[PDB]
Amino acid sequence: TFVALYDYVASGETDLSFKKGERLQIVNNTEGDWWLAHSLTTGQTGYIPSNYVAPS
């Protein structure tokens, strides 16, 4: 479980928007730049920038 450090607005069809403070479950971290995540706060799924979140 990770927490969002900053708001992120999705710019494409596979990334996930989230608000600062949202809690997320990381599903796929094979790549170092983009992680597939699942929002525990909102239940939505998509790719997020890995440097927008921190473990919590």
Residue numbers in the entry: 85 to 140
How did the manuscript describe this experimental structure?
The Src homology 3 (SH3) domain is a ∼60-residue modular domain that consists of two antiparallel β-sheets orthogonally packed to form a single hydrophobic core. This domain is present in many proteins and regulates critical cellular pathways by recognizing polyproline-rich motifs (PRMs; Kurochkina & Guha, 2013). Three-dimensional domain swapping (3D-DS) is a mechanism by which some proteins can oligomerize by exchanging identical domains or structural elements between monomers. In previous work, the 3D-DS of the c-Src SH3 domain has been characterized and its dependence on experimental conditions has been described. This work explores the role of the hinge-loop composition by interchanging residues in the RT and n-Src loops between two SH3 domains: one being the c-Src SH3 domain, where 3D-DS has been described, and the other being the Abl SH3 domain, where 3D-DS has not been described to date.
Introducing the Abl residues into the n-Src loop of the c-Src SH3 domain does not increase hydrogen-bond formation, as happens in the monomeric structures of Src_Abl-nSrc and Src_Abl-RT. Additionally, while maintaining the hydrogen bond between Glu106 and Ser123, the distal loop exhibits diverse conformations in the c-Src SH3 domain. We do not have the structure of the monomer of Src_Abl-2, but the monomeric structure of Src_Abl-RT exhibits the same behaviour in the distal loop. As this loop is critical to the folding of the SH3 domain, this feature may explain why the opening of the folded domain is facilitated in these chimeras.
